[PDB]
Amino acid sequence: GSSGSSGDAGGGVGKELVDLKIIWNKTKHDVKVPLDSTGSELKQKIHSITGLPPAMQKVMYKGLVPEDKTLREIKVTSGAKIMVVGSTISGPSSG
Questions:
Q1: Domain carrying residue 39
Q2: Which end of the chain has fewer CB atoms surrounding its CB within 10 Å, N or C?
Q3: Nearest to residue 24, comparing CAs of 67, 90, 88?
Q4: Per DSSP, which regions of the chain are E strands?
């Protein structure tokens, strides 16, 4: 009998999403996000994982993170630590 197959070949591909560590309390979630992500997106980028509100979030990586500038602008690289605050999840009322 015996059976099996596999393939992997293409070309190009510059730089894919950047690997970031979602630091919160004591967790490490490896998420791949584009550097084109605005410093503001991070919030929604973290909330999308942390599940917590951004208003109660603390986006700070070895320095304040501007929302007017993207990661690639705020100076981010593959392996950029991201600290977050919070404890008890919380959702909105209206939305």
A1: 1-95
A2: N
A3: 88
A4: 18-24, 27-33, 80-84
Q: Which residues contact 82 (CB under 8 A, 6 or more apart)?
A: 20, 21, 22, 23, 42, 46, 59, 61
Breaks in the chain after (C-N > 2.5 angstroms)? none
Least Cα distance to 35 among 2, 70, 1 occurs for 70
* HSE-up of residue 1 (Cα within 13 Å, Cβ side): 0
Task: Report the CATH number at residue 59.
Answer: 3.10.20.90
Domain total of the chain: 1
Provide the experimental method for this PDB entry: NMR
**What six digits make up the tokens of 6?**
């596999």
**What would the two tokens of residue 33 be?**
């996000």
